[PDB]
Design a binder for this molecule. Sequence first.
Ligand code: HEM
Ligand code: HEM
Ligand SMILES: [Ca+2]
Lengths: 145, 148
Amino acid sequence: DLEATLRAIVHSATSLVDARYGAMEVHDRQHRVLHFVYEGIDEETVRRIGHLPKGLGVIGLLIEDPKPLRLDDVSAHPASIGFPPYHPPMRTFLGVPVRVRDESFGTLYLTDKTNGQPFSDDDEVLVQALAAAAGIAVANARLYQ
Amino acid sequence: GAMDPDLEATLRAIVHSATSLVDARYGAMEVHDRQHRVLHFVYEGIDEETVRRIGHLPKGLGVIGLLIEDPKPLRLDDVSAHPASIGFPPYHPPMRTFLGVPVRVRDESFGTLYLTDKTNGQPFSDDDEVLVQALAAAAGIAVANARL
Ligand code: HEM
Ligand code: HEM
Ligand SMILES: [Ca+2]
């Protein structure tokens, strides 16, 4: 199960960096969301947010220009779209492409590192390594699909 | 044959992250084929001239073999003092502290990941162990899914 694999990867990034929230979006070539897996948010809150993300704002930027982006305050970025109603507030941000050499498929991202601290270069490098493994898994899934 | 380029990039990244984050002097991964045979060996911490002097690549012997018969993390404070230790070959840096884990997906085994000589002279920690286990699990995903 690809979804399972992806969630495991999200868990490793979130727990190892010690971020409150972690997510991964995987899209098709027309940027429709194929998979969205996450942790750190309770189910009642999920229900309140309602609609799934479409990959806009800073995530949209990460799709257009796939390279790591680390932010002290995600809302202060010029490409920030803002959160929908009921979405938990989130401040610090680290996002990287999930990809292989031939193609990028998605974005693995974390917010609100513990104790208000910004994401570090070490965190960036770690999340890239985890994302790479995801990238191979997704590339295999397409070949299989 | 050479490893798949994406696989190789991914495994080198995982080895680098593990080595950096547990503050090890040396880190390495063996990728295995059938019957736990070493197929590829990825490492960092050793200069090219020393690699030349050592010559032959590891067969995955000694303490590294325990990672396969006992699929659990192994930490040791003096690796070459272990009775299963085969010893270092000529020109190989001496190494003391060791943290090793199997690389797996479910029960299926794909290699080993291991680090030596934490830079502060200290033993590898519980946190180091958890981190290296998670990175090994990611390496397992990478190897299992790699382009044939
Ligand atoms: C728990 C992990 C999550 C993280 C780390 C996260 C992070 C983010 C971030 C960083 C933004 C950027 C807004 C901007 O550009 O200013 C965003 C927007 C958004 N989020 Fe989340 N989020 C999470 C969970 C969820 C869930 C569970 C949902 C709904 C089920 C959701 C729905 C949305 C929507 C609809 C947007 C607006 C932009 C878009 O449509 O992509 N988020 N989120
Ligand atoms: C830089 C990361 C490396 C680490 C962490 C590492 C670690 C180890 C350890 C702990 C042992 C002893 C096992 C025992 O006594 O049971 C060993 C043995 C050995 N090493 Fe390394 N080593 C590294 C690099 C290399 C390189 C670059 C070479 C060759 C160019 C090499 C060749 C060997 C060989 C031939 C043995 C003998 C056992 C066998 O063949 O498996 N090592 N290594
Ligand atoms: Ca302990």
